[PDB]
């Protein structure tokens, strides 16, 4: 996250960090004790993934962390159907052992399709992660967060030559300077509704970071809430 | 009607006979007494911050 602030411990208890061949390479959000939702481009098959919930400072500890191994990965079936489009950029990770819920490990709420869209339409969401704090620069140690305004679709379309599908939305500022960035993918875009947060998007892609005239692009979660609910049922 | 102020529902609203409204809440919550607000029904319901942060207050 470029231009954001340090989160306080337990401020975003649904945020998890993913570690693998590269440390802290993407983010994710807790759906329930056994499931994480993230971006499909962070987990294209192969490699071993480790999830850390209750994380705050990647190089310190307050003993709130819970590390789990990923036993199953489910990228949306249409992801990568069209080469290099980033359309359908969402995926689910099943944990080996359930997480124990507490003040530092809490699920993000997920409304139905209609309400997720209404919540997105509120126009202000929070994005968070341990990704780049400067375009082409270092990654964060302490979890970063930033409020980003929704951008009308027409303006979104005109900001880039790449295609913005009905499965994506733009968020950021006309002047730039504040944005999600490399490493923040898979992390959540959330909307707070009277003290309760709902997942409204997934950090997905962009052109560089925080550039004036450009915006961060997010996976539109409302189009995928039925799929999430169907794949993450607990037995 | 859910037309205005989401029918006064804290979370979800659905229109009912004669311009009436039925409020509802997400998993982990239950409709409160007023049949408008949403109440925690589990120790750690989704989307809420419970660390309260800091510790300098009445509590």
CATH number of the domain bearing residue B21: 2.10.25.10
Same domain, A92 and A134: no
Q: Which residue has the tokens 């401020």?
A: A11
* CA max distance for chain A: 48
- Number of residues that this document lists for chain A: 235
Cross-strand partners of A26: A18
Contact list in B for residue A99 (CB cut-off 8 A) is: none
Same domain, A66 and A158: no
Total domain count for chain A? 2
Same domain, A32 and A117: no
Distance from CA of B47 to the nearest CA of A (A): 4
Cross-strand partners of A189: A127, A201
Q: Which residues of B26-56 are buried (b: 16+ CB within 10 A; e: fewer)?
A: bebbebeeeebbbebeeebbbbbbebeeeee
- Show the domain range for B45: 1-59
Is position A41 annotated as part of the catalytic site? yes
Q: How many Å apart are CA A33 and CA A35, to the nearest integer? A: 6
Write the DSSP string, chain A: -BS-EE--TTSSTTEEEEESSSTT-EEEEEEETTEEEE-GGG--SSS--EEEES--BTT---S--EEEEEEEEEE-TTTTSSTT--TT--EEEEESSPPPPBTTB-PPB---HHHHHHHHTT-EEEEEESSBSSTTSPBPSB-EEEEEEEE-HHHHHHT-SS---TTEEEES-TT-S-B--TT-TT-EEEEEETTEEEEEEEEEE-SSSS-TT--EEEEEGGGGHHHHHHH----
Same domain, A162 and A70: no
Same domain, A103 and A140: no
Strands B20-24 and B29-31: unpaired
Q: How many Å apart are CA A11 and CA A82, to the nearest integer? A: 37
* CA max distance for chain B: 49
The enclosing domain of A144 has a CATH number of: 2.40.10.10
Q: How many Å apart are CA B21 and CA B42, to the nearest integer? A: 25
Same domain, A213 and A227: no
Same domain, A177 and A123: yes
Q: Which residue has the tokens 């660390």?
A: B51
- Show the domain range for A181: 1-12+108-222
Q: How many Å apart are CA A151 and CA A220, to the nearest integer? A: 13
Other CB atoms within a 10 A radius of the CB of residue B3 amount to: 10
Distances, alpha carbon A190 to alpha carbons A15, A70, A132, B9, in Å: 11, 24, 19, 20
Contact list in B for residue A101 (CB cut-off 8 A) is: 43-44
Q: What's the half-sphere exposure (Cβ side, CA atoms, 13 Å) at A84?
A: 1
Same domain, A112 and A185: yes
Name residues 24-53 of chain B within 8 A of A (Cβ): 26-29, 38, 43-51, 53
Contact list in B for residue A193 (CB cut-off 8 A) is: 10-11
Total domain count for chain B? 1
Other CB atoms within a 10 A radius of the CB of residue B8 amount to: 14
Q: Which pair of tokens denotes residue B53? A: 């942060």
Q: Which residue has the tokens 């997934």?
A: A202
Same domain, A99 and A160: no
Q: Which pair of tokens denotes residue A187? A: 């992390």
Same domain, A139 and A171: yes
Same domain, A97 and A41: yes
For A151, phi then psi, to 5°, come to: -115, 130
The catalytic position among A29, A56, A88, A89 is A89
Other CB atoms within a 10 A radius of the CB of residue A162 amount to: 15
Nearest-5° angle of CA A216, CA A222, CA A223? Answer: 95
Same domain, A114 and A201: yes
Q: Which of A69, A86, A7, A73 is nearest to A37 (CA)?
A: A73
């Amino acid at each position: 996250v470029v231009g954001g602030e340090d989160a306080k411990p337990g401020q975003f208890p649904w945020q998890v960090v993913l570690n693998g061949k590269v440390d802290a390479f993407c983010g994710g959000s807790i759906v329930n004790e056994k499931w994480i939702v993230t971006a499909a481009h962070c987990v294209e098959t192969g490699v071993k993934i480790t999830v850390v919930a209750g994380e705050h400072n990647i190089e310190e500890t307050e003993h709130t962390e819970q590390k789990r191994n990923v036993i199953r990965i489910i990228p949306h079936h249409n992801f990568n159907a069209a080469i290099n489009t980033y359309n359908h950029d969402i995926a689910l990770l099943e944990l080996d052992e359930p997480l124990v819920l507490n003040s530092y490990v809490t699920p993000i709420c997920i409304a139905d399709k209609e309400y997720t869209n209404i919540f997105l339409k509120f126009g202000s969401g929070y994005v968070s992660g341990w990704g780049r704090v400067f375009h082409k620069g270092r990654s964060a140690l302490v979890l970063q967060y930033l409020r980003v305004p929704l951008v009308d679709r027409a303006t979104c379309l005109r900001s880039t030559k790449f295609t913005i599908t009905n499965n994506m939305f733009c968020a950021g500022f006309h002047e730039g300077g504040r944005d999600s960035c490399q490493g923040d993918s898979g992390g959540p875009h959330v909307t707070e509704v009277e003290g309760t947060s709902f997942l409204t998007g997934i950090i997905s892609w962009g052109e560089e970071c925080a550039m004036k005239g450009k915006y961060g692009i997010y996976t539109k979660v409302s189009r995928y809430v039925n799929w999430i609910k169907e794949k993450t049922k607990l037995t | 009607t859910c037309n205005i102020k989401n029918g006064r529902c804290e979370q979800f609203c659905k229109n009912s006979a004669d311009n009436k409204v039925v409020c509802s809440c997400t998993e982990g919550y239950r409709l409160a007494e007023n049949q408008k607000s949403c109440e925690p029904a589990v120790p750690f319901p989704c989307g809420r911050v419970s660390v309260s942060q800091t510790s300098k207050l009445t509590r």
